């Protein structure tokens, strides 16, 4: 049959020109104690690590 996508991963990963982008953790609820530098630097998107690129490729074949 056709390969099926892992929708949970598809909702966390998007494709770039040469790789995959992702959001960062530790920014949801507990924030008062965290410093301003951490608050600002954890914002935005980052790139998926090469070691973990293979699993993302397996879980998201068509993206």
């Amino acid at each position: 049959a056709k390969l099926k996508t892992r929708r949970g991963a598809a909702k966390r990963f998007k494709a770039t020109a040469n790789g995959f982008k992702r959001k960062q953790a530790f920014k949801r609820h507990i924030l008062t104690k965290k410093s301003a530098k951490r608050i600002r630097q954890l914002r935005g998107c980052v790139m998926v690590h090469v070691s973990d690129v293979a699993s993302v490729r397996r879980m998201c074949p068509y993206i």
């Binding site: 892992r6 949970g8 991963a9 909702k11 966390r12 990963f13 998007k14 992702r22 959001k23 960062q24 953790a25 920014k27 949801r28 973990d52 699993s55 993302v56 397996r58 879980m59």
Partner: protein
């Protein structure tokens, strides 16, 4: 030459398939490359992809973000060079669809400066970038 018993494939076209468990000399005898014992040695022994031994998975320890846009599915992007496939001087959504550069179910199209054009065109109801418009004018076309 030109006989049924004188026809051969190209070098490197065909490779013998690998057969496991057919003697010591083959090099894949007995265990057949699976190793010794364990889950992976058993039949259907692979674990599910994305399973890391119990630790929270990569796709589950990261946050969800974004939402899907409906109009983006029907929006179409067209390279400048593809206008050569168009038959005639009038470039429109219908003409692009006829030339098969835009799928039938799309509702609007955009033209971007990607290639080169050596013809004169008149664009009707299609969005143009600054560079694409400049290229069309240079080639001798018009808009609207």
């Amino acid at each position: 030459t030109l006989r049924l018993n004188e026809l051969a494939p190209a070098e490197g076209a065909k490779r013998e398939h690998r057969r496991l468990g057919r003697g010591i000399g083959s090099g894949v005898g007995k265990t057949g490359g699976r190793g010794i014992k364990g889950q992976k040695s058993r039949k259907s022994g692979g674990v599910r992809p994305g399973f890391e031994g119990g630790q929270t998975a990569i796709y589950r320890r990261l946050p969800k973000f974004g939402f899907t846009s409906q109009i983006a599915l029907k929006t179409a992007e067209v390279r400048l060079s593809e206008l050569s496939k168009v038959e005639g001087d009038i470039v429109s959504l219908e003409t692009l669809k006829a030339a098969n550069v835009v799928r039938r179910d799309q509702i609007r199209a955009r033209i971007v400066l990607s290639g080169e054009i050596t013809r004169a065109f008149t664009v009707q109801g299609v969005a143009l970038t600054k560079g694409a418009k400049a290229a069309i004018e240079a080639a001798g076309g018009k808009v609207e």
